[PDB]
Short mmCIF file of C-alpha atoms in Angstrom, two decimals:
data_model
loop_
_atom_site.label_atom_id
_atom_site.label_comp_id
_atom_site.label_asym_id
_atom_site.label_seq_id
_atom_site.Cartn_x
_atom_site.Cartn_y
_atom_site.Cartn_z
CA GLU A 15 -5.95 189.56 46.66
CA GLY A 16 -4.45 189.11 43.03
CA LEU A 17 -5.15 190.89 40.04
CA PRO A 18 -8.76 192.06 39.18
CA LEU A 19 -10.35 190.79 35.94
CA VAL A 20 -12.48 193.39 34.13
CA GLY A 21 -14.83 192.36 31.87
CA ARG A 22 -17.43 194.34 29.59
CA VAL A 23 -17.96 197.86 31.06
CA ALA A 24 -21.05 199.84 31.46
CA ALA A 25 -21.42 203.48 29.93
CA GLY A 26 -20.51 205.77 32.33
CA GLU A 27 -19.25 203.51 34.89
CA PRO A 28 -15.42 203.46 35.79
CA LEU A 29 -13.38 200.43 34.84
CA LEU A 30 -12.77 198.83 38.38
CA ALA A 31 -16.42 199.17 39.34
CA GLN A 32 -17.20 196.24 41.56
CA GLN A 33 -19.80 194.54 39.36
CA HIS A 34 -17.53 194.47 36.36
CA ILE A 35 -14.89 192.45 38.55
CA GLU A 36 -15.23 188.74 37.38
CA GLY A 37 -12.50 187.38 39.36
CA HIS A 38 -9.10 187.81 40.79
CA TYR A 39 -6.27 186.26 39.32
CA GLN A 40 -2.97 185.40 40.91
CA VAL A 41 -0.72 186.48 38.46
CA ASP A 42 2.59 188.24 39.87
CA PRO A 43 2.03 192.29 38.80
CA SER A 44 5.82 192.80 38.30
CA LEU A 45 5.97 190.07 35.67
CA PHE A 46 4.95 193.08 33.69
CA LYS A 47 6.82 196.34 32.68
CA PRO A 48 5.14 198.40 34.02
CA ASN A 49 3.04 196.79 36.50
CA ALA A 50 -0.12 195.23 35.79
CA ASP A 51 -3.21 197.07 37.48
CA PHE A 52 -5.59 194.69 36.24
CA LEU A 53 -6.81 192.22 33.38
CA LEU A 54 -9.44 193.58 30.83
CA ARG A 55 -10.91 190.99 28.42
CA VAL A 56 -10.31 191.74 24.72
CA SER A 57 -13.46 191.82 22.78
CA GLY A 58 -13.10 191.37 18.94
CA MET A 59 -10.45 190.32 16.38
CA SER A 60 -9.79 194.30 16.15
CA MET A 61 -5.74 193.52 17.20
CA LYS A 62 -5.51 190.14 15.89
CA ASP A 63 -2.24 191.16 13.95
CA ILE A 64 -0.08 191.43 16.84
CA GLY A 65 -1.58 188.60 19.12
CA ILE A 66 -4.47 189.93 20.90
CA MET A 67 -7.42 187.42 20.39
CA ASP A 68 -11.00 187.78 21.23
CA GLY A 69 -11.13 186.55 24.94
CA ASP A 70 -7.60 187.38 25.61
CA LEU A 71 -7.23 188.93 29.11
CA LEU A 72 -5.12 192.34 28.33
CA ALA A 73 -2.76 193.25 31.00
CA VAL A 74 -3.27 196.94 31.91
CA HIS A 75 -1.19 199.36 33.67
CA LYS A 76 -3.52 202.14 34.81
CA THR A 77 -1.94 205.19 33.47
CA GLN A 78 -3.29 208.73 31.38
CA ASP A 79 0.60 208.78 30.18
CA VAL A 80 0.97 206.72 27.19
CA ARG A 81 3.25 207.78 24.06
CA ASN A 82 2.76 206.90 20.32
CA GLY A 83 2.75 203.69 19.01
CA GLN A 84 1.74 202.08 22.35
CA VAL A 85 -1.38 199.76 22.42
CA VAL A 86 -3.58 201.58 25.22
CA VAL A 87 -6.72 200.87 26.48
CA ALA A 88 -9.14 204.33 25.91
CA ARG A 89 -12.80 205.50 26.31
CA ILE A 90 -14.58 207.23 23.37
CA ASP A 91 -17.79 208.28 24.75
CA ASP A 92 -18.15 205.24 26.86
CA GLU A 93 -16.44 203.21 24.29
CA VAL A 94 -13.66 201.00 26.19
CA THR A 95 -11.30 200.05 22.88
CA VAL A 96 -7.92 198.50 22.60
CA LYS A 97 -5.92 200.03 20.03
CA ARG A 98 -2.41 201.79 18.90
CA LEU A 99 -2.08 205.14 19.88
CA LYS A 100 -1.01 208.12 17.37
CA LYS A 101 -2.21 211.27 18.43
CA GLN A 102 -1.20 214.67 16.52
CA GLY A 103 -2.47 217.68 18.51
CA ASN A 104 -5.92 217.51 19.02
CA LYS A 105 -6.48 214.68 16.56
CA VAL A 106 -6.27 211.43 18.71
CA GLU A 107 -6.00 208.11 15.90
CA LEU A 108 -6.55 205.05 17.50
CA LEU A 109 -5.21 202.42 14.75
CA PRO A 110 -6.31 198.85 14.90
CA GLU A 111 -4.03 195.48 13.69
CA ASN A 112 -6.58 194.15 11.33
CA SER A 113 -7.16 195.04 7.69
CA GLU A 114 -10.80 194.61 8.12
CA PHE A 115 -10.90 197.41 10.38
CA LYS A 116 -10.62 201.21 9.57
CA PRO A 117 -9.07 203.63 12.18
CA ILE A 118 -11.04 205.42 14.88
CA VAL A 119 -10.27 209.21 14.38
CA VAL A 120 -11.33 211.35 17.24
CA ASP A 121 -11.23 215.29 17.63
CA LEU A 122 -10.59 215.93 21.59
CA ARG A 123 -12.22 219.45 20.75
CA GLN A 124 -15.59 217.68 19.98
CA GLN A 125 -15.14 214.16 21.65
CA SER A 126 -14.76 213.00 25.15
CA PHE A 127 -11.43 211.00 25.26
CA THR A 128 -10.04 209.14 28.15
CA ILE A 129 -6.54 206.87 28.41
CA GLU A 130 -7.66 204.30 30.56
CA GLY A 131 -4.38 202.49 30.84
CA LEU A 132 -1.28 200.77 28.92
CA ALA A 133 -1.14 197.44 27.69
CA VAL A 134 1.70 195.72 29.17
CA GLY A 135 1.03 192.23 27.96
CA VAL A 136 -1.41 189.45 27.48
CA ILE A 137 -2.71 186.49 29.59
CA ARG A 138 -4.40 183.65 27.33
CA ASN A 139 -6.10 180.99 29.74
CA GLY A 140 -9.31 179.77 29.10
CA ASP A 141 -12.27 178.61 30.84
CA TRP A 142 -10.50 176.93 33.88
CA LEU A 143 -13.31 175.37 35.77
CA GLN B 117 -12.47 156.93 44.99
CA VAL B 118 -12.77 161.03 44.96
CA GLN B 119 -16.31 162.02 45.82
CA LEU B 120 -17.85 165.47 46.31
CA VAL B 121 -20.22 166.34 49.03
CA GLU B 122 -22.36 169.36 48.91
CA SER B 123 -24.45 171.59 51.55
CA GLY B 124 -26.47 174.54 51.66
CA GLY B 125 -29.30 175.75 49.41
CA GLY B 126 -32.93 175.98 49.69
CA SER B 127 -35.77 178.75 49.19
CA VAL B 128 -35.16 182.38 49.40
CA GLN B 129 -37.04 185.70 48.59
CA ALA B 130 -35.34 188.60 46.45
CA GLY B 131 -32.48 189.36 48.11
CA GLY B 132 -31.17 187.37 50.97
CA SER B 133 -27.94 185.74 51.21
CA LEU B 134 -27.43 181.81 50.45
CA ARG B 135 -24.43 180.04 51.48
CA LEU B 136 -23.19 176.62 49.69
CA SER B 137 -20.14 174.85 50.26
CA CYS B 138 -18.55 171.55 48.21
CA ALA B 139 -16.34 169.19 50.11
CA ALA B 140 -13.70 166.80 48.04
CA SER B 141 -12.73 163.60 49.62
CA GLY B 142 -10.62 160.33 48.87
CA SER B 143 -7.31 159.27 47.56
CA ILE B 144 -6.64 162.96 46.12
CA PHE B 145 -2.90 164.09 44.81
CA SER B 146 -4.19 167.50 44.24
CA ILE B 147 -6.87 169.50 43.98
CA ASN B 148 -6.56 171.97 41.13
CA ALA B 149 -9.88 174.18 41.09
CA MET B 150 -13.12 173.62 42.35
CA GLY B 151 -16.40 175.61 41.69
CA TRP B 152 -20.18 175.62 40.97
CA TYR B 153 -22.03 175.39 37.71
CA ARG B 154 -25.79 176.09 37.59
CA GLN B 155 -28.57 174.17 35.42
CA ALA B 156 -31.89 176.23 35.03
CA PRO B 157 -34.57 174.00 33.79
CA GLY B 158 -34.55 174.29 29.83
CA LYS B 159 -31.27 175.80 29.26
CA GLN B 160 -27.68 174.80 29.53
CA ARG B 161 -25.13 174.18 32.52
CA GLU B 162 -23.68 177.47 33.30
CA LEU B 163 -20.54 178.15 35.18
CA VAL B 164 -21.38 180.27 38.34
CA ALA B 165 -18.01 180.60 40.07
CA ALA B 166 -14.39 179.12 40.12
CA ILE B 167 -11.33 179.23 42.58
CA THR B 168 -7.99 177.72 42.76
CA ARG B 169 -6.12 176.11 45.20
CA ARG B 170 -3.79 179.58 45.27
CA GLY B 171 -6.78 181.48 45.45
CA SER B 172 -7.69 182.82 41.79
CA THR B 173 -11.20 182.98 41.47
CA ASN B 174 -13.44 183.73 38.25
CA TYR B 175 -17.21 184.66 38.11
CA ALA B 176 -19.72 184.43 35.41
CA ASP B 177 -21.14 187.56 33.42
CA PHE B 178 -24.41 187.45 35.70
CA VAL B 179 -22.91 187.05 39.19
CA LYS B 180 -22.01 191.17 39.06
CA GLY B 181 -20.30 191.55 42.76
CA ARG B 182 -22.92 189.39 44.43
CA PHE B 183 -21.42 186.02 45.04
CA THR B 184 -18.08 185.06 47.11
CA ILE B 185 -16.36 181.90 46.66
CA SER B 186 -13.75 180.83 49.31
CA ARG B 187 -11.78 178.14 50.09
CA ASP B 188 -10.24 176.24 52.74
CA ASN B 189 -7.05 174.22 52.08
CA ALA B 190 -7.38 172.31 55.19
CA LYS B 191 -11.09 171.07 55.19
CA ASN B 192 -10.12 170.66 51.33
CA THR B 193 -13.55 172.74 50.87
CA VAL B 194 -15.04 175.26 48.78
CA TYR B 195 -17.42 178.23 49.91
CA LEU B 196 -20.01 180.08 47.86
CA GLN B 197 -21.66 183.08 49.65
CA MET B 198 -24.29 184.31 47.31
CA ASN B 199 -26.36 187.60 48.39
CA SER B 200 -28.89 189.79 46.47
CA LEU B 201 -30.85 186.45 44.99
CA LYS B 202 -33.19 187.09 41.81
CA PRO B 203 -35.92 184.99 40.42
CA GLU B 204 -33.43 184.32 37.49
CA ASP B 205 -31.14 182.68 39.71
CA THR B 206 -33.31 180.02 40.79
CA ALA B 207 -31.43 176.48 39.68
CA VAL B 208 -29.51 173.36 40.37
CA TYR B 209 -25.84 174.21 41.66
CA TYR B 210 -23.64 171.37 40.69
CA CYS B 211 -20.23 171.37 42.19
CA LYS B 212 -17.37 170.93 39.84
CA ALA B 213 -13.83 170.30 40.51
CA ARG B 214 -10.96 169.06 38.72
CA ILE B 215 -8.58 166.70 40.77
CA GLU B 216 -5.43 164.89 40.10
CA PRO B 217 -6.28 161.46 41.81
CA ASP B 218 -3.78 159.38 43.91
CA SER B 219 -3.51 156.73 40.95
CA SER B 220 -2.95 159.45 38.40
CA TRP B 221 -0.40 161.78 39.18
CA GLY B 222 -0.19 164.32 36.00
CA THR B 223 -3.58 163.44 34.76
CA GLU B 224 -6.66 165.25 36.02
CA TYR B 225 -10.02 164.54 35.86
CA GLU B 226 -13.64 166.34 36.10
CA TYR B 227 -15.50 165.13 38.95
CA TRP B 228 -19.37 166.63 39.51
CA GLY B 229 -21.39 166.96 42.85
CA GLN B 230 -25.22 165.55 42.73
CA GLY B 231 -26.79 168.65 42.90
CA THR B 232 -28.43 171.25 45.30
CA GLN B 233 -31.65 172.91 44.64
CA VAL B 234 -31.82 176.58 44.67
CA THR B 235 -35.08 178.32 44.74
CA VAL B 236 -35.52 182.06 44.11
CA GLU C 106 8.21 178.59 43.22
CA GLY C 107 6.43 178.26 40.20
CA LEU C 108 6.69 177.73 36.56
CA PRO C 109 9.98 177.31 34.98
CA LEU C 110 10.89 178.95 31.63
CA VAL C 111 12.64 176.96 29.20
CA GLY C 112 14.16 178.48 25.91
CA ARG C 113 16.53 176.93 23.35
CA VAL C 114 16.29 173.40 24.51
CA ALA C 115 19.90 171.22 23.37
CA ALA C 116 19.62 168.76 20.77
CA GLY C 117 18.91 165.50 22.63
CA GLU C 118 18.40 166.62 26.15
CA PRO C 119 15.67 166.74 28.15
CA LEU C 120 13.46 170.12 27.83
CA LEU C 121 13.24 170.75 31.74
CA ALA C 122 16.60 170.23 32.11
CA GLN C 123 18.30 173.01 34.50
CA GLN C 124 20.54 174.57 31.67
CA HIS C 125 17.66 175.27 29.82
CA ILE C 126 15.49 176.98 32.62
CA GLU C 127 15.43 180.67 32.17
CA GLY C 128 13.61 181.25 35.28
CA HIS C 129 10.75 180.72 37.37
CA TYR C 130 7.42 182.85 37.36
CA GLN C 131 4.87 182.94 40.21
CA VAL C 132 1.62 182.27 38.20
CA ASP C 133 -1.02 180.17 39.21
CA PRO C 134 -0.46 177.13 37.20
CA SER C 135 -4.50 176.24 37.89
CA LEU C 136 -5.41 179.09 35.62
CA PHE C 137 -4.88 176.64 33.19
CA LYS C 138 -6.88 173.57 32.16
CA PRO C 139 -5.08 171.26 32.58
CA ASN C 140 -2.69 172.65 34.80
CA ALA C 141 0.41 174.44 33.20
CA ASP C 142 3.53 172.39 34.13
CA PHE C 143 6.07 175.10 32.44
CA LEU C 144 6.80 178.04 29.86
CA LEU C 145 8.41 177.69 26.70
CA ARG C 146 9.29 180.77 25.08
CA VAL C 147 7.97 180.84 21.23
CA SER C 148 10.33 181.16 18.76
CA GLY C 149 8.51 182.22 14.84
CA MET C 150 5.07 183.42 13.54
CA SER C 151 4.10 180.11 12.75
CA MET C 152 1.33 180.28 14.85
CA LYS C 153 0.38 183.88 14.39
CA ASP C 154 -3.26 183.50 13.50
CA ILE C 155 -4.07 181.78 16.32
CA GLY C 156 -2.44 184.60 18.58
CA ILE C 157 0.84 182.94 19.32
CA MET C 158 3.34 185.32 18.96
CA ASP C 159 7.41 184.95 18.45
CA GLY C 160 8.73 185.45 22.44
CA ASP C 161 5.45 184.51 23.91
CA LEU C 162 5.35 182.28 26.51
CA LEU C 163 3.30 179.15 26.12
CA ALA C 164 1.53 177.24 28.91
CA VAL C 165 2.25 173.81 28.41
CA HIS C 166 0.97 171.03 30.36
CA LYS C 167 3.25 168.14 30.40
CA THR C 168 1.79 164.98 28.81
CA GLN C 169 1.88 162.50 25.96
CA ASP C 170 -1.65 162.04 25.32
CA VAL C 171 -2.59 164.42 22.94
CA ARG C 172 -5.50 163.91 20.36
CA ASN C 173 -5.40 165.46 16.83
CA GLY C 174 -6.68 168.81 16.47
CA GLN C 175 -4.77 170.13 19.45
CA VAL C 176 -1.94 172.62 19.61
CA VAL C 177 1.15 170.69 20.94
CA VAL C 178 4.61 171.07 21.54
CA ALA C 179 6.51 168.35 19.78
CA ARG C 180 9.89 167.29 19.33
CA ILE C 181 11.11 166.20 15.35
CA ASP C 182 14.65 165.07 15.39
CA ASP C 183 16.29 167.17 18.04
CA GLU C 184 14.12 170.27 17.26
CA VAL C 185 11.09 171.58 19.17
CA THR C 186 7.98 173.10 17.20
CA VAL C 187 4.81 174.49 18.68
CA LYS C 188 2.23 173.07 15.97
CA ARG C 189 -1.20 171.95 15.37
CA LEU C 190 -0.95 167.59 15.46
CA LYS C 191 -2.82 165.42 12.95
CA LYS C 192 -1.31 162.06 13.12
CA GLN C 193 -2.74 159.31 10.71
CA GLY C 194 -0.16 156.36 11.27
CA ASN C 195 3.38 156.82 11.07
CA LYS C 196 2.55 159.84 9.25
CA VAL C 197 2.18 162.81 11.58
CA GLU C 198 1.52 166.13 10.35
CA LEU C 199 2.38 169.21 12.06
CA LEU C 200 0.11 172.13 10.74
CA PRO C 201 0.95 175.64 11.55
CA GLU C 202 -1.43 178.65 11.86
CA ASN C 203 0.29 181.06 9.18
CA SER C 204 -0.23 180.89 5.43
CA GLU C 205 3.56 181.63 4.71
CA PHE C 206 4.00 178.43 6.53
CA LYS C 207 4.07 174.97 5.36
CA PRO C 208 2.88 171.70 7.11
CA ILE C 209 5.54 169.40 8.55
CA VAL C 210 5.69 166.03 7.72
CA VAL C 211 7.39 163.32 9.89
CA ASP C 212 7.96 159.67 9.22
CA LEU C 213 8.02 157.94 12.55
CA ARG C 214 9.79 155.37 10.74
CA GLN C 215 12.93 157.86 9.61
CA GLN C 216 12.70 160.44 12.11
CA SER C 217 12.48 160.57 16.20
CA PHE C 218 9.32 162.47 17.21
CA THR C 219 8.21 162.83 20.59
CA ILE C 220 5.10 164.65 22.12
CA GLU C 221 6.41 167.00 25.18
CA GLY C 222 3.18 168.39 25.84
CA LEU C 223 -0.30 170.18 24.94
CA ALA C 224 -0.82 173.87 24.98
CA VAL C 225 -3.07 175.29 27.48
CA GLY C 226 -2.48 178.92 27.59
CA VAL C 227 -0.13 181.83 26.61
CA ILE C 228 1.72 184.36 29.01
CA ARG C 229 3.00 187.56 26.88
CA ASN C 230 5.22 189.33 29.34
CA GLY C 231 8.15 191.22 27.76
CA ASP C 232 11.60 191.55 29.88
CA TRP C 233 10.15 193.29 33.12
CA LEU C 234 13.61 194.72 33.98
CA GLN D 261 15.92 210.15 47.17
CA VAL D 262 16.92 206.76 46.24
CA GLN D 263 19.89 204.49 45.39
CA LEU D 264 21.24 201.16 44.45
CA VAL D 265 24.24 200.16 46.84
CA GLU D 266 26.25 197.52 45.26
CA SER D 267 28.39 195.53 46.74
CA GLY D 268 30.74 192.59 45.57
CA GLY D 269 32.78 191.25 42.31
CA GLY D 270 36.50 191.24 41.25
CA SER D 271 38.56 188.58 39.73
CA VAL D 272 38.21 185.16 39.63
CA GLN D 273 39.73 182.37 37.41
CA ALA D 274 37.66 180.01 34.98
CA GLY D 275 35.00 177.93 36.98
CA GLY D 276 35.06 180.51 39.95
CA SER D 277 32.11 181.74 41.93
CA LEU D 278 31.26 185.18 42.72
CA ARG D 279 28.63 186.85 45.08
CA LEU D 280 26.96 189.92 44.00
CA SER D 281 24.77 191.91 46.15
CA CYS D 282 22.80 195.23 45.63
CA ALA D 283 20.14 196.99 47.83
CA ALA D 284 17.73 199.66 47.50
CA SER D 285 17.49 202.79 49.95
CA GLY D 286 15.81 205.81 50.07
CA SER D 287 11.85 207.18 50.02
CA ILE D 288 11.09 204.08 48.71
CA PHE D 289 6.99 203.03 48.41
CA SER D 290 7.59 199.91 46.04
CA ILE D 291 10.27 197.65 44.69
CA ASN D 292 8.71 196.13 41.52
CA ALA D 293 11.87 194.28 40.38
CA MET D 294 15.74 194.21 40.84
CA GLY D 295 18.46 192.74 39.57
CA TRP D 296 22.00 193.13 37.05
CA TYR D 297 22.70 194.11 33.65
CA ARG D 298 26.12 193.57 32.11
CA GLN D 299 28.27 195.73 29.31
CA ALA D 300 31.14 194.42 27.54
CA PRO D 301 33.44 196.82 26.06
CA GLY D 302 31.79 197.46 22.43
CA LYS D 303 29.00 195.72 23.24
CA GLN D 304 25.44 196.79 24.71
CA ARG D 305 23.93 196.22 27.92
CA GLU D 306 22.36 193.12 28.62
CA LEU D 307 20.11 191.78 31.34
CA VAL D 308 21.51 188.94 33.61
CA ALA D 309 19.06 187.95 36.10
CA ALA D 310 16.12 189.75 37.68
CA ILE D 311 13.86 189.03 40.50
CA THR D 312 10.34 190.46 41.89
CA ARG D 313 9.06 190.47 45.19
CA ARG D 314 7.23 187.72 44.88
CA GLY D 315 9.98 185.73 43.70
CA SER D 316 9.78 185.51 40.18
CA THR D 317 13.43 185.03 38.44
CA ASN D 318 14.09 185.44 34.74
CA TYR D 319 17.65 184.99 33.67
CA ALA D 320 19.30 185.38 30.05
CA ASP D 321 20.67 182.92 27.57
CA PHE D 322 24.06 182.84 28.76
CA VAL D 323 23.52 182.06 32.16
CA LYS D 324 22.76 178.25 32.10
CA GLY D 325 21.57 177.61 35.41
CA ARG D 326 24.97 178.63 36.84
CA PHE D 327 23.87 181.92 38.20
CA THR D 328 20.96 182.12 40.77
CA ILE D 329 19.28 185.58 42.04
CA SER D 330 17.71 185.70 45.56
CA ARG D 331 15.94 188.26 47.80
CA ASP D 332 15.61 190.07 51.12
CA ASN D 333 12.64 191.63 50.96
CA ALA D 334 13.01 192.89 54.72
CA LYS D 335 16.40 194.02 53.65
CA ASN D 336 15.58 195.20 50.48
CA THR D 337 18.61 193.54 49.19
CA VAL D 338 19.10 191.06 46.01
CA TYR D 339 22.01 188.62 45.23
CA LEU D 340 22.87 186.89 42.58
CA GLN D 341 25.46 183.77 42.95
CA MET D 342 27.50 183.54 39.79
CA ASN D 343 28.97 179.68 39.84
CA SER D 344 30.82 178.80 36.89
CA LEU D 345 31.84 181.76 35.45
CA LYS D 346 33.80 181.91 32.03
CA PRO D 347 36.10 184.64 30.18
CA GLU D 348 32.89 185.42 28.17
CA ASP D 349 31.44 186.47 31.32
CA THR D 350 33.82 189.85 31.79
CA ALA D 351 31.89 192.84 31.82
CA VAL D 352 30.77 195.67 34.29
CA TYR D 353 27.73 194.41 36.19
CA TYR D 354 25.25 197.36 36.82
CA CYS D 355 22.49 196.68 39.46
CA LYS D 356 19.32 197.70 38.11
CA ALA D 357 15.65 198.55 39.71
CA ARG D 358 12.34 199.04 39.41
CA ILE D 359 10.89 201.24 41.75
CA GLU D 360 8.02 203.82 42.55
CA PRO D 361 9.61 206.11 45.08
CA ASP D 362 6.94 207.61 47.48
CA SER D 363 7.71 210.88 45.53
CA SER D 364 6.05 209.94 42.65
CA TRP D 365 2.89 207.30 43.81
CA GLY D 366 1.93 205.37 41.01
CA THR D 367 4.67 206.12 38.87
CA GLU D 368 7.81 203.73 38.53
CA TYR D 369 11.20 204.69 37.17
CA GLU D 370 14.25 202.82 36.59
CA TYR D 371 17.30 203.17 38.96
CA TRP D 372 21.05 202.08 37.92
CA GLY D 373 23.85 201.28 40.18
CA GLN D 374 27.74 202.43 40.18
CA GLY D 375 28.50 199.52 38.20
CA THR D 376 30.90 196.70 39.59
CA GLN D 377 33.51 194.76 37.48
CA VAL D 378 33.55 190.90 37.19
CA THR D 379 36.57 189.68 35.59
CA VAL D 380 37.51 186.27 34.52
CA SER D 381 40.92 185.08 33.55
CA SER D 382 43.39 181.95 32.88
CA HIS D 383 46.62 181.91 34.53
#
């Protein structure tokens, strides 16, 4: 089939929900380390300093196991975001790569927080038809 | 000369399942991607569904896993199975294709179909 | 066997010379419009502001027919660069996307200038092994 | 239990060819990528060549189209044909692999081989 294309994810719904999948791309998953499980459309210039521009497809490996300093896809009360991880105990900080955005601070005690996957790369094609 | 031949389309009520097809013919060196756009009276031309020769597919934000684009490389054809139709889906569906014709290998041109009425 | 990968290209040797081919990636060429013909490793942060980063693989359509405004791969006297085109006569101006970088001015009389192709996308993957 | 069985190498003189081979055996769910690294005395380990199951290949700078990595998915084996060996190519060549073992579904791990020495000489 190929790598699914997850666009904007409705609140509550899982990422790979059938009505979020706007295509399947024939990219060799193992070109990414670890494997690309899906491609998520980046929305925002929250990450532009490292080259994750709006409309980019992020290559994501589906895991909850991510270490600090890594770019993660996260959910904060149904807000699928792409930031860098700095967790200190119950203090999870989702840092952006842009001087116009301020960090997201999450207290695991208060907010519901899920790591959806690891950023393993970027595919930037446009519209191809 | 490259030509795009459309078939399918018509009238249907809420739900239902109409099937489109578009086929490229003529002096073709390669078909890089075929697919479908829709024009609803008054608004702009929108992409519905694209599909490459090796099988990558792409869908517009309004098709929420209701349409299914297919290809037949031998028959040089593309198919759009659209189910769960809606009033807002009513439009003219134009086939679109990127072809490198025989003359120009490496140069690619956009070719369009005449259009199909799809009424819901 | 799919898109070739070209690194450092030899001075006065074709870009897709076997010696420069650092591998063949299985990515759907037609995921790019127009078709990607090869991938070039990006050297330097000249284009950081459009999202082209050092080490990125630029998806390039092999052509010479490029119009002003486009991002192109160009060879200026045995050096290959990825820049935005602004040709006006025998004065071609290869513009960057980074304030720390200054436009390149090529004088077609004095130096050799070829256009290798058009940038049609970006793949950012790492070492995958 | 999974393993990288290496096979080949030794010495040649300049411009000499040498086939390397490496297979992965055991409780494997998925081979994501196999290939070869190398270590020269004093210097660090560098990638030589890599191949995925779909046929994607990557090579380092120093291989200028003189090496060719290939695979037999049914034999879970990869082969590297090195062709125009230079004295700069002398090193231990460790086969490396990215494998999901069926032990740990979904997680991949790095696996290494014993290391085979490739030596390139001058009479």
